[PDB]
Amino acid sequence: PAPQDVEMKEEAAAGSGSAGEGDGKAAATEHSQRELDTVTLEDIKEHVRQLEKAVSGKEPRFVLRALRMLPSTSRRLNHYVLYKAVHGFFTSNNATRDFLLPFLEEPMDTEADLQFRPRTGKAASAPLLPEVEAYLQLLMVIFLMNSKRYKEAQKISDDLMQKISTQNRRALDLVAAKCYYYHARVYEFLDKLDVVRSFLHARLRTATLRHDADGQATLLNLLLRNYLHYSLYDQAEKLVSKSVFPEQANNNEWARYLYYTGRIKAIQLEYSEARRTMTNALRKAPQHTAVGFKQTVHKLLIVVELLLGEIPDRLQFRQPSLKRSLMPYFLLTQAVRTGNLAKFNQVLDQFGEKFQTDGTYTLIIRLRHNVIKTGVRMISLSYSRISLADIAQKLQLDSPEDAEFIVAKAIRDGVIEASINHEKGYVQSKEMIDIYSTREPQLAFHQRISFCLDIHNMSVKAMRFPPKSYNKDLES
Amino acid sequence: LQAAAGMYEQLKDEWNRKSPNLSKCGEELGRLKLVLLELNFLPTTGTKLTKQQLILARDILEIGAQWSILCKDIPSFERYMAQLKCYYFDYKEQLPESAYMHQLLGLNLLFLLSQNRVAEFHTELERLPAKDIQTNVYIKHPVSLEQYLMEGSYNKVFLAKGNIPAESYTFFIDILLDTIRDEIAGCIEKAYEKILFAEATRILFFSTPKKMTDYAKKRGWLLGPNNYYSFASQQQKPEDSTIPSTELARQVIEYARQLEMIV
Amino acid sequence: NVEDDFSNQLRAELEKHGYKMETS
Amino acid sequence: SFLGPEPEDLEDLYSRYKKLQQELEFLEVQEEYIKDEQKNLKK
Amino acid sequence: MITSAAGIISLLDEEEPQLKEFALHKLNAVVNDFWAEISESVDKIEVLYEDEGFRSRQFAALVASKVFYHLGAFEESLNYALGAGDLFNVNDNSEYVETIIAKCIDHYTKQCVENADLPEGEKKPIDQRLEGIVNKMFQRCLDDHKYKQAIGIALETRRLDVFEKTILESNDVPGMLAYSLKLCMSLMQNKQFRNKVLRVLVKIYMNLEKPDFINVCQCL
Amino acid sequence: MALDGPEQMELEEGKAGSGLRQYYLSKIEELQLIVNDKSQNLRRLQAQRNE
Amino acid sequence: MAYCGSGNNKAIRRLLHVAVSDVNDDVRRAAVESLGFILFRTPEQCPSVVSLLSESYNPHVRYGAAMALGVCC
Amino acid sequence: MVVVYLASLIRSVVALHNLINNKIANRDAEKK
């Protein structure tokens, strides 16, 4: 039948998860636990096993088929992703589950280390019991975020995943830490008025008491994403500053943090820094899990780069092959370059609704300073002494006098750097025609030397950690 | 007792023209905080029950704040406003939505400019969404005005669009004809290494020596037609030095220490 | 984005012949 | 969720940990010694 | 709709002492759900604790402990916690604000090691709030009849009294005592504190023929 | 767990003993880290020194 | 003898430290024998410590290493 | 670093496999 074919792969899924739990339980093996847990296992569990072969009715077959309700409720947790009490909360195509025929296979392998017989479910006290429970939830959450489940299922995730846990450990908190972040993205997507932020805050207190590196990193990045949606600026600003955000973090974590920090910085008139992190973020983000947030980074970033006075290329639009969705941003790119306001104001209002979703709209209005700035910027840098009159004819500014105030303000900001001599009336470039007399070639090299040294210190410590973890746990 | 509808509620008389005094409204708000206690304790947690309570909580606070601008009690307005901000942002379908909501938002926005914190405007604007929950009409005047000042225009800035609302936005303009002047003047300090007095006064929009003196003090500029625009330009030039190595090279101690550990 | 130079090709060849006389 | 052996958790501080600490202090000493020695082989 | 703590915080800034007193109360209920916002306004909370002129002075200190834990600042939580001087009970029953209560015990025990030199007992020179959570920690030991619980705590504090009678009744004498001997020699190299602990053990042994003589020989 | 938590015998949870649980838990987790980090530094250095 | 029955951290550190630095042959050999003695009560810690010494081609250190292991265990 | 990590990933498979082999051996015994 249909669940028999995918049965081979369920034993495979169980092999990787069971081991992962095992590792965690013996002291601090933390580094090896987080790489396994996130993009690597997940890309396989969902896509290869369930979707590709077909049969998504192997997910609540995986976390139940014994009839475990667990000593602290998690029976519901398993239902809601798939097979609510009917055939499919998305895709069924299963003739055996725990509400169709109990048992057909054991991914549970008759030992508490993912799942185990009903004897655990009704009551246990074992030290294997928290370890299976935290783990139980990671396995479930994997289909939730990929398939983009919604509704009530989304609302009840939070309850089971935290306020059943307020005591964990470092091993357990790490697993839970990953589960909360995936649910949080699924939550964000629906654009429900029911507070995403509130749960994520409650989860933070538990993260902090165990003092688990992982818990702080995951929650914090999501908490910023939540904050942007509501559009309550002050809290996110403080929260970003508090995040130390560890150097030993998963790839998806790295791309998402830089991305949030960029959104926050862009409105602020810290656009030079915002644009670098946002460009980086797109590259760093994967091909599979990342896709919802990923879209949003490329759309926002095009506006953010303009804010610095960068003129973004056509290759940028064509190459990921999203050019259609990007088409309006493309229009802003043209408008910024020309130096004339009329085209920029018109586009801002017309696409206004579409921009607001992505969270661009607050950044779009800031470009009005930038429309003129980007055009005066090319002209001031290129030439030496040029008249305000040249700037105004080319750019289509109102007056040379108008153009004179505008250049003055920019040199104060210092992203065009010049000194104006309104005698004859030219704007003058800064330039020394030798930078060897100045420290600047040395200072440039020296900065690299600090940046380089950081890589050496990071590498020596990181290198031994996974083989060490493997030694205690025993390797074949 | 309250500030609610009907003239039997004591602050309401002050909101209307029954008490013409601008400072007896603001004054009377202090008493009103005691009556506020009961009406603001319940709706600081959102529920549809708490919808009747919300309206009244806001009424006392908004009315008091509005009247303060007229007589330039403005710092006191900004602390009163804060409470209003949270109610306008949220508490959806329990009636934050009013004529009062609109007026109040625009008043606050205007104030950030009066302090000359460009930065403060952008964060604040986004916080309330104070540009799509009552829309840019009256609200338009501070938003466009802040965009123009940031841009560096001191010729499409507007003050005429702030007299389209006369909902006590009309008293903020008074102190925003100061601010436009302030900004031109700072930019001019950066602008010139040194230029003629004559060329610089027509752009200041000063043309009497008294006006020159007044803002010159703030700038640090000495005398009236005479001024030293040059201070700001002078700062750029020290990159030329090389003779004292210790600071100029920089991080000499830092790079060495880490390097020694590694090998 | 797209280079303004292309549009410039047709315009630049022609300009050359006139310009030399017009201005020194 | 909650840890399985609460009597082992309350007892462990006084029991296993106290005793261990002495054994660990030697282990620290062996870590500094290796470094000194490592640098000495280099001479 | 609600998701924003902000309005409750604004009330604190607004004028009249009575407005502030209700606001602080409500600000304590919401702090768990939204930690992030409250923490910006953390400094404002500090001054309301500072002033003794509030009735809700206790609540102000309490509000500060709750933000400070959430950040990770356990020590800062404690300076304010000792300040309230009450409402430790409500923290104590919980399983989140229990982190400050746990801390008072962790602080007490280090301070005592220092304090031990001149007066042997932890007693009166260390403060009343921390000593109170510690006396309760002793009461826990006695009730559970965990001999292990008693011994460890006693070592840190440097009191003899708890080592000697691990449960006060002391009708479970052979084997409670044995534990004290192995644990003092292993942990420390401190000769001086050891000599004292052993002496108390002599007095209990002397009285009763109930404890096993294998235990006494170890002490001798 | 807690003072008002599970188990009414109070030796097999230490019912009373709990509710201060964070005091205990902190210590045990701290050991796990220390022992671990010292062991990593030492083995890796021993490998380099043996070469 | 003295540190036997609860060993100090400072005391083990010295014993190791004197041995590496010395050019005096008898002094070197000796330093290594005591390491087993202070650890007599926890025999577990000694074979690791001795391992580093066993590996060198210095016969004086090799001599002491044997003794250390002998007494602890 | 990168080289040791690619190897580290291969070590991971053996090391995980060991915990599962034990499971399979425990279950064959309890099921008879």
TrEMBL record, chain A:
Keyword Calcium applies: no
InterPro entries: CSN3, PCI_dom, PSMD3_C, TPR-like_helical_dom_sf, TPR_PSMD3_N, WH_DNA-bd_sf
Name of the featured protein: 26S proteasome non-ATPase regulatory subunit 3
GO cellular component terms listed in the entry, alphabetical order: cytosol; nucleoplasm; proteasome accessory complex; proteasome complex; proteasome regulatory particle
Coiled-coil regions listed in the entry: none
One Gene Ontology term from the biological process aspect of the record: regulation of protein catabolic process
PCI domain ranges (all copies): 255-434
A GO molecular-function descriptor: enzyme regulator activity
Keywords in alphabetical order: Isopeptide bond, Phosphoprotein, Proteasome, Ubl conjugation
Subunit structure: Component of the 19S proteasome regulatory particle complex. The 26S proteasome consists of a 20S core particle (CP) and two 19S regulatory subunits (RP). The regulatory particle is made of a lid composed of 9 subunits including PSMD3, a base containing 6 ATPases and few additional components. Interacts with UBQLN1 (via ubiquitin-like domain). Interacts with ERCC6.
Keyword Protease: no
Pfam families: PCI, Rpn3_C, TPR_PSMD3_N
Family in the record: Belongs to the proteasome subunit S3 family.
Biased composition (Basic and acidic residues): 31-40
Organism: Rattus norvegicus (Rat)
Automatic annotation (TrEMBL), chain B:
Claim: ATP-binding is one of the keywords in the record: no
Domain PCI span(s) in chain numbering: 75-244
Assigned keywords, A-Z: Proteasome
GO biological process, one term: proteasome-mediated ubiquitin-dependent protein catabolic process
GO cellular component: nucleus; proteasome accessory complex; proteasome complex; proteasome regulatory particle, lid subcomplex
Its job: Component of the 26S proteasome, a multiprotein complex involved in the ATP-dependent degradation of ubiquitinated proteins. This complex plays a key role in the maintenance of protein homeostasis by removing misfolded or damaged proteins, which could impair cellular functions, and by removing proteins whose functions are no longer required. Therefore, the proteasome participates in numerous cellular processes, including cell cycle progression, apoptosis, or DNA damage repair.
Description of how the protein assembles with itself and partners: Component of the 19S proteasome regulatory particle complex. The 26S proteasome consists of a 20S core particle (CP) and two 19S regulatory subunits (RP). The regulatory particle is made of a lid composed of 9 subunits including PSMD8, a base containing 6 ATPases and few additional components. Interacts with DDI2. Interacts with TASOR.
Recorded family membership: Belongs to the proteasome subunit S14 family.
Protein name in UniProt: 26S proteasome non-ATPase regulatory subunit 8
Lineage: Eukaryota, Metazoa, Chordata, Craniata, Vertebrata
Entire-sequence positions represented here: 91 to 353 of 353
Automatic annotation (TrEMBL), chain C:
Domain of life: Eukaryota
Keywords for this protein: Nucleus, Proteasome
Keyword Cytoplasm attached: no
Localization in the cell: Nucleus
Chief place of localization: nucleus
GO biological process terms on file: double-strand break repair via homologous recombination; mRNA export from nucleus; proteasome assembly
GO cellular component terms attached to this protein's record: integrator complex; proteasome complex; proteasome regulatory particle, lid subcomplex; protein-containing complex
Family listed: Belongs to the DSS1/SEM1 family.
Function: Component of the 26S proteasome, a multiprotein complex involved in the ATP-dependent degradation of ubiquitinated proteins.
Protein name (record): 26S proteasome complex subunit SEM1
Species per Swiss-Prot/TrEMBL record: Rattus norvegicus
Residues of the full protein shown: 47 to 70 of 70
From TrEMBL, chain H:
Source taxon at top rank: Eukaryota
Residues spanning the signal sequence: none
Sequence similarity: Belongs to the peptidase M67A family.
Name of this protein: Proteasome 26S subunit, non-ATPase 7
Lineage of producing organism: Eukaryota, Metazoa, Chordata, Craniata, Vertebrata
Gene assigned in the entry: Psmd7
Region of the whole protein represented: 263 to 294 of 326
